Structures are given as structure tokens and as C-alpha cells.
Amino acid sequence: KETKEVYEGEVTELTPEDKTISHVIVGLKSAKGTKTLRLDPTIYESIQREKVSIGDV
Amino acid sequence: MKALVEEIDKKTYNPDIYFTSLSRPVKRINYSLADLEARLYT
Amino acid sequence: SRSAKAGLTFPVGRVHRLLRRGNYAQRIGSGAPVYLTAVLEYLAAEILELAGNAARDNKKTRIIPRHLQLAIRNDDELNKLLGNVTIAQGGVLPNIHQNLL
Amino acid sequence: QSRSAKAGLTFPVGRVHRLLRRGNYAQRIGSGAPVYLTAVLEYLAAEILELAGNAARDNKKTRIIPRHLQLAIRNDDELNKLLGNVTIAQGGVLPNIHQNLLP
Amino acid sequence: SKARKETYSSYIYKVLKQTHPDTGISQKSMSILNSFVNDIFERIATEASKLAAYNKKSTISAREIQTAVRLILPGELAKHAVSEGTRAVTKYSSST
Amino acid sequence: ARKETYSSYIYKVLKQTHPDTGISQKSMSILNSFVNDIFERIATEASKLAAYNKKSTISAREIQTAVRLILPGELAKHAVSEGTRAVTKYS
Amino acid sequence: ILRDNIQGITKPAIRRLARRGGVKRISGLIYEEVRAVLKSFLESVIRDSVTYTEHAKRKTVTSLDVVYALKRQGRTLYGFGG
Amino acid sequence: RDNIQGITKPAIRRLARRGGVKRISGLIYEEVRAVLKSFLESVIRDSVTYTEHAKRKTVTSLDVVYALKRQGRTLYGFGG
Amino acid sequence: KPHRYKPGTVALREIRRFQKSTELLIRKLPFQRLVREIAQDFKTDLRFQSSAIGALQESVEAYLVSLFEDTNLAAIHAKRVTIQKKEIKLARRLRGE
Amino acid sequence: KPHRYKPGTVALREIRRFQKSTELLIRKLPFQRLVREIAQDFKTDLRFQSSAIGALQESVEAYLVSLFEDTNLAAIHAKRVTIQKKEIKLARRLRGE
């Protein structure tokens, strides 16, 4: 038995932090909330693989 | 282990400046007049 | 006296008689002047140690009212406790504004 | 007959005298002090009653709302200087309009 | 379910009938007047207690109420309150 | 004539805390005004707090909640701890 | 109920309270600063309310607890529970 | 006759130096003199009140300290 | 031809409208959950009467009105019509807080 | 070659000079005739002790010092170094007077 965290939302900004080694803050706009999160370069590389843009769930 | 996902604010968080913090205790305050005037005039 | 067996310095009979003749209530308990001498002894010991260290800062073996003024005003709980109290011959704090420099 | 009618008072002397006895103020209480206190409280209460009464007469109402008492207290200088921190519930504020904000 | 409570309803209604016997008073403003008389009672009572404690005396007379009213009130309210108070007291003591 | 002050008690607590530094007479009068003022503070708050509960008896409960209400939480915390320690050690 | 009830005070409510005070134009940080002053004020009164409620051996706060709580602070709130 | 002018302008200048004021205009001495004129009436009137209640012809230090007691100022030092 | 007011007109009639009203401008339920929210971490499982809530809301409303009047005069001293954060810190600090 | 200071130097050393001194800045005789002058029209033929005059002068001096500090911060809020009459009315009115 194990618990896992689930994140989802509409992508608002894909931008480095302010200075960098290339990480990307992904601002996920959900319905009931808006939060920004910082990710690893590998999951950001898969984000570049999925060909997402501004406004994709 | 190392979390690949990190929640972060836009205004409060900066990637460069990282800061972490937590009979009667009382901070030490110098009652010297020349120390306070020496601090305020430098 | 009952101050030495309880670890007190201020007398219990003077405070108990002052509460009796001070027109506060009809019945007066026995632990209330002991509690009052405990609180007044702790607070007076606090002003004595803060004014004592404030006298130790300026290299003087006597307590002037300026040492008590800086000892009270430099503490946050003493300034919040007594904000309207005017101390004679205590002076003011060396507060210099930054924009006037 | 109570001693309020022979002295020209409305508030009772026995309730104020007993309240001063059981209020833990002093050991000995005089006899003219509750009469003086009912005189001062009767004059002041009559003052608020006539000022709030005329303030109720200004807005053409036969009942005293707390706004009439609020304007009656705040419009007087001695009542504002006497009570400056007193907050009146459902009394509103004064129509204070600044001159520089006008076009 | 209620035993008894004390208020100034009939007295404020009687002075109301003495000043302007047309305008009525609501219950909430009557409670505000009850808080007013109950507050000023503690004001002149507490000032009489401290003023009696300052003179090293255990007796509260009309002198302490007179100088207490003269010290905690403006000169108009203390002047007319001192005049009407001394008038009611000296008119009271003349009956005997 | 006689007068009452806290000179020997403040001198004794002075000898208990730091028995080197002396105290002037004027600052001793300021401390006398301080203890004489806070005595009227906790005494008056005990009188009004005893009057609020419709009781004619002032106990250590009224001094405890009075000290807890008129002081900040540090001074009321250590004053309540040392006060209950002195009272429970006394009884 | 237990999570961020400080945001329940709306911005047009602070705008109406600014209209009561005679304010013409209102900037951005006024609602946050007024919300912070209200947040300190409700602790400053409510803490004394829990103090008198704990001393009164009661589990329910009454009007005498609020009026007597504001009595020692010099505010002397009349009206309800005088 | 006009003892209110006894307070000199360099005295108010020194009291401005105690408060951290750099430059002082012209009406500051008149406004400060008026505030002091109202203040001495506001304290001295209560001093004559307590002196008249005390059945005394001489004002003492307890009259001044007890006069400033009810106003919340609580002046310590002389006559505490 | 649309009919619009110039900026500065509706604020004056809002002053004339709300300054004649003695009603409360804050709703009962967010103030209820706010009072219970501050009362949560002090003492658990408390109760509140039907009274003593409009007293806190009344003193909060009138005290905030007087604070907006003193802060409004502080913004008047700055020779402008806009209220700023330093006006709230100025009028808050100069009142003895 | 005369030696003169620039405007703004002697005020700072006057602050350093007087802020280290606890002496009274008002003389005893104009305050004496002033106190007797206010005491003339209240009660005729009064007496004053040798004490209770430096208490009024001490509370007047320290209260005027705190009023000059609050008025000085009020002039600091106006983004200038000069004190004005509206600063005294502002810092006087905002303290509850």
C-alpha cells in the first residue's frame, strides 16, 4: 500500500527562474486553483516531447 | 529520495537566495550610547 | 515569617493587610498576597537585572535613571506594558533617522 | 414615600446607596452622596433625552433611533469631549464631505 | 425561568414624560442609556473612591461627589450639575 | 513620623541578582512608584474581576487570570509558573 | 471553516468601508493592509474573550464577555450586552 | 502681564534639536507656545481642583502626580 | 451614444448613499467563519451566542471607519486623493499603536 | 580666509550635544511666572512649593520632545526636512487630541 501525488492543470508559463541552469517553472492552471511548480530537466524534457504549449491540459 | 517536483511561488521564491529558519529568552541588546551612535553614523 | 518558608522577599502581612484595608472585597484569600508578592518579586527582579546589566554596559557601579529608561524602552514587553509612563531624568533613546543623514 | 419625591429626584436613592455600599468603594458612605449622584445622573440623562428628543424632532419621527442619539452626541462639543472613544451601535457616522474632493 | 433584573426603564420613561411626552423610546436605545448611566455611575463612584483614598479618609460625602463631578466633567456640565446637585441636596436637608 | 517603602527588599533582590552594582535613591523611588503602581493595577483588576463573577471573595484564581490578562504571555507565563510554584510550595 | 477564512472579506466591502470614511480613490495594498490590521485586531480582542470565557468557567461566549473584554481596553462598547 | 513670551525661541530650537528636527519654520514657536498654553491650563486647572479639595493654599508634588494620574500620564520621580 | 460618468462622480454619490445608512457592510457568515477560525487555535470546541457577533463586527466596522477617516486625512496631508500603505502605517503608528 | 560651516552641519552636532544631556532647557523664572500667571485667574493668592515645578517642566519638556519626534516623523512623511504648522496639527490631531 502506497500513496502518490497527482498534479494536473492548464499550462500557463514555461520559463526559467530569475541566473539559470535550465529548469522550468510550470504554472498549472486548474479549475479550483492556480499553482506554479518547479520540475526536473528530465520531466521537462518529456514536456518538450509531448509538444505542449501555452494553454494545453 | 530526491523529489523531482517542487512547489514554488513566483514572488516569494528566488532560485538564488535560499533561506531556511525555524528562564525568559531575550536577545542581547547593547545599552551603550557610543555603540548605537557609532552604528547609526557609519 | 511565612515569606522565608515560601521563598519570598516581600512580606505577606503588609500586602494582605493592604488588601484588607484597600476596599477591594469582603473576603480575602490566603494565597493571593503570596501570589502577588511572587509576581511583584519576579517583575522587580526583572527590572533589577535589566537595569543592572544596563548599568553594566556603561561601566558604572550605580544605577542612574537613564539605565532604567534604556532598560525599559529597549525591551518589547516593558514598552508594551508601560507605554505612557514618563521617567524623570531618564532621557530619550538615540534614534537617528536615515533620510536625514 | 421615598426620599426622591421630597428632594425633587426621579432615580431612587436606596438603589444607588446600596450599590455604593456593596460596590467596594469605601468603609463609610455619606447620605448626600447618592442624592448628588442621582442629581448629576438625572441632569445628564435629561440632557441626552432633550438633545436626542430634538434630534428626533428634526427628522420628523416620533421614535428615537440610535442615529438621532449619535448625531445628538457628536454634534455637541461637551458630549464629544466627554465621550470620544465611545462606539454607538447602529448610529452611523456624520455627513462629513471634504471641500477639496468636490469638483 | 428568570428571577429578577434591575434597569432604569420607568425612570427614563418618566423623565421622557417630563421633557417631551410625545416621542417614544426604542428598547435598544433604552439599553444604551442603561449602559450610559451604569457607566457614569462607575465613573463618579470610582473617582469618589480614589478621591476619598487620596485624602486619607474613609468617608465619602457630597464634597467628594462635588469635586469629582467638577474634575471629570467640562465646566458647563459640572457647573449646572453642581448647581442643580447642591440645589437638590440643600433642598433635601431643609425638610428634616 | 514613619513612612513605608521597599528599600531593603529591592536591596536584597539586588544582592540576590548582582551584589556589586549599587542603586541610587531616585531610581529606588522610581522602583517604588513602579511596585506601587502595579500593585494598584493587579489589585484593581482583581477588584473588577471579582465584581464580574458576582462574588465577594478574592482568591489566587483572580490574581492568576488577572496577571494572565493584563500582562504579555511571557511575563504572565513565567509569573504564573513562579507564582503557582510559590503558592503550591507555600501550602 | 478551518482553512483561510481571512479571505472572506471581499474587496467591495473594503471599498464600501472606504466610502464610509470619505476616501475617493483606493490603491491595491489597502485591502491587504486593512485585512492584516483586522487580523491582528480580532486576535487582540478574541484572545481576551477566550481569557474571560476561560475564567468564567463557560463554554459559550456571551455579550458581557465582549463588552467587559473591551472595557479594560478603553473602548467601552455600548449597545448589545451593556 | 504676558509671561507666555518668557519661553525663548532658542529654547524651542533646542527642544527641536532634542526631537531630531533639522530645519524649523516661523510659526513653530507660536504653535508650540499655544499648545503649551493650553497644556498648562489643562494640568494646572486640575491642580487647583485637587488643591481646593485638599483644603490647602500650597500646591504639593502629590497634587501634581495625582493630577496627572487620572489623565493616564503617570508622572514618576518627584512626589511618587 | 452611450451615457457614462466621468471618473470621480460615482464615488461622491456613494459617499452620500452609504453615509446616510447605518447598516453593516460585512456579511454574517464570513465574519462567523472568521471569528470561529481565530477561535479555533485558542480553545477547541467553543460555542458562540447569537449575540456578541454584531458587537465585534460593529466595533470592527466603526473602528475601521475612524481608521479610514484618519488615514484619509493622512492622505489629504500628502496633497493627493489616493490612500497608500504608508498612510495606513503613518495613521496607525501615530495613534499610539 | 574665514572658516564657516555649510548649512546642515551644526544641527547634527547640536543633536549629538543635546541628546546626550538630561538637563532642562527651560529656565526656572519664566516658567515660574508663567505657572503663577496661569494660576492667577483660577484661584487668587496661591502658593507653590519648591517641588512640583520641575515635574510640570519635566512632563512639559518630555511630552514636547515626544511631540517634536512625532511631528518630525510627520515632516519626514512629507519628504522634506522642515517642520510646518500643518505637521503640528496633523501629529497633534492623529494622537487623539
Swiss-Prot record, chain C:
PTMs per UniProt: Phosphorylated to form H2AS128ph (gamma-H2A) in response to DNA double-strand breaks (DSBs) generated by exogenous genotoxic agents and by stalled replication forks. Phosphorylation is dependent on the DNA damage checkpoint kinases MEC1/ATR and TEL1/ATM, spreads on either side of a detected DSB site and may mark the surrounding chromatin for recruitment of proteins required for DNA damage signaling and repair. N-acetylated by NAT4.
GO cellular component terms listed in the entry, alphabetical order: nucleosome; nucleus
Induction: Transcribed during late G1 and S-phase, repressed in G2.
Residues recorded as bearing N5-methylglutamine in the entry: Q89
Locations listed in the record: Nucleus; Chromosome
A biological process from GO: DNA repair
Residue positions where N6-succinyllysine is found in the record: K5
Keyword list, A-Z: Acetylation, Chromosome, DNA damage, DNA repair, DNA-binding, Isopeptide bond, Methylation, Nucleosome core, Nucleus, Phosphoprotein, Ubl conjugation
Superkingdom per UniProt: Eukaryota
GO molecular function, one term: DNA binding
Note: In contrast to vertebrates and insects, its C-terminus is not monoubiquitinated.
The protein's assembly and partners: The nucleosome is a histone octamer containing two molecules each of H2A, H2B, H3 and H4 assembled in one H3-H4 heterotetramer and two H2A-H2B heterodimers. The octamer wraps approximately 147 bp of DNA.
Family designation: Belongs to the histone H2A family.
UniProt domain comment: The [ST]-Q motif constitutes a recognition sequence for kinases from the PI3/PI4-kinase family.
UniProt protein name: Histone H2A.1
From Swiss-Prot, chain E:
Keyword DNA-binding in record: yes
BP-aspect Gene Ontology terms: chromatin organization; negative regulation of transcription by RNA polymerase II; postreplication repair; regulation of DNA-templated transcription
A Gene Ontology term for the protein's cellular component: nucleosome
Residue numbers bearing the N6-succinyllysine modification: K2, K14
Post-translational modification: Monoubiquitinated by the RAD6/UBC2-BRE1 complex to form H2BK123ub1. H2BK123ub1 gives a specific tag for epigenetic transcriptional activation and is also prerequisite for H3K4me and H3K79me formation. H2BK123ub1 also modulates the formation of double-strand breaks during meiosis and is a prerequisite for DNA-damage checkpoint activation. Deubiquitination is performed by UBP8 in presence of SGF11. Phosphorylated by STE20 to form H2BS10ph during progression through meiotic prophase. May be correlated with chromosome condensation. H2BS10ph is also formed after H(2)O(2) treatment, and is a step leading to apoptosis.
Covalent cross-link (Glycyl lysine isopeptide (Lys-Gly) (interchain with G-Cter in ubiquitin)), residues: K91
N6,N6-dimethyllysine: residues bearing it: K5
Molecular function terms, GO-annotated: DNA binding; protein heterodimerization activity; structural constituent of chromatin
Alphabetical UniProt keywords: Acetylation, Chromosome, DNA-binding, Isopeptide bond, Methylation, Nucleosome core, Nucleus, Phosphoprotein, Ubl conjugation
Keyword Nucleus: yes
Location (main, coarse): nucleus
Cell compartments where the protein resides: Nucleus; Chromosome
Subunit description: The nucleosome is a histone octamer containing two molecules each of H2A, H2B, H3 and H4 assembled in one H3-H4 heterotetramer and two H2A-H2B heterodimers. The octamer wraps approximately 147 bp of DNA.
Name assigned to this protein: Histone H2B.1
UniProtKB/Swiss-Prot annotation, chain G:
Modifications the protein undergoes after translation, according to the UniProt entry: Glutarylation at Lys-71 (H4K91glu) destabilizes nucleosomes by promoting dissociation of the H2A-H2B dimers from nucleosomes.
GO molecular function, one term: identical protein binding
Key words of the record: Acetylation, Chromosome, DNA-binding, Methylation, Nucleosome core, Nucleus, Phosphoprotein
Residues bearing PTM Omega-N-methylarginine: R35
Residue positions where N6-glutaryllysine is found in the record: K71
Primary localization: nucleus
Localisation: Nucleus; Chromosome
Single biological process term from Gene Ontology: nucleosome assembly
Reported effect, K71Q: Mimics acetylation; does not show increased sensitivity to DNA damaging agents
Modified residues (Phosphoserine): S40, S44
GO cellular component, one term: nucleosome
Residues found modified as N6-acetyllysine: K59
Residues annotated with N6-succinyllysine modification: K11, K57
UniProt family annotation: Belongs to the histone H4 family.
Subunit structure, as described in the record: The nucleosome is a histone octamer containing two molecules each of H2A, H2B, H3 and H4 assembled in one H3-H4 heterotetramer and two H2A-H2B heterodimers. The octamer wraps approximately 147 bp of DNA. Histone H4 is a component of the UAF (upstream activation factor) complex which consists of UAF30, RRN5, RRN9, RRN10, and histones H3 and H4.
Function description: Core component of nucleosome. Nucleosomes wrap and compact DNA into chromatin, limiting DNA accessibility to the cellular machineries which require DNA as a template. Histones thereby play a central role in transcription regulation, DNA repair, DNA replication and chromosomal stability. DNA accessibility is regulated via a complex set of post-translational modifications of histones, also called histone code, and nucleosome remodeling.
This protein's name: Histone H4
Gene: HHF1
Covered residues, full protein: 22 to 103 of 103
From Swiss-Prot, chains I, J:
Residues found modified as N6,N6,N6-trimethyllysine: K43
Chain positions found as N6-acetyllysine: K1, K20, K28
GO BP terms: aerobic respiration; chromatin organization; global genome nucleotide-excision repair; intracellular copper ion homeostasis; nucleolar large rRNA transcription by RNA polymerase I; positive regulation of transcription by RNA polymerase I; regulation of DNA-templated transcription; rRNA transcription
One annotated GO molecular function: cupric reductase (NADH) activity
Keyword terms of this UniProt record: Acetylation, Chromosome, DNA-binding, Methylation, Nucleosome core, Nucleus, Phosphoprotein
Coiled coil feature spans: none
Keyword Repressor (UniProt): no
Consequence of changing K43 to A/P/Q: Compromises telomeric silencing
Entry-annotated residues carrying N6-succinyllysine: K43
A cellular-component GO term for this protein: CENP-A containing nucleosome
Modified residues (N6-malonyllysine): K20
Residues found modified as N6-methyllysine: K1, K43
Modification N6-propionyllysine, positions: K20
UniProt subcellular location: Nucleus; Chromosome
Family: Belongs to the histone H3 family.
Binding partners and assembly: The nucleosome is a histone octamer containing two molecules each of H2A, H2B, H3 and H4 assembled in one H3-H4 heterotetramer and two H2A-H2B heterodimers. The octamer wraps approximately 147 bp of DNA. Histone H3 is a component of the UAF (upstream activation factor) complex, which consists of UAF30, RRN5, RRN9, RRN10, and histones H3 and H4.
Record's miscellaneous remark: Present with 213000 molecules/cell in log phase SD medium.
Protein name as catalogued: Histone H3
Gene: HHT1
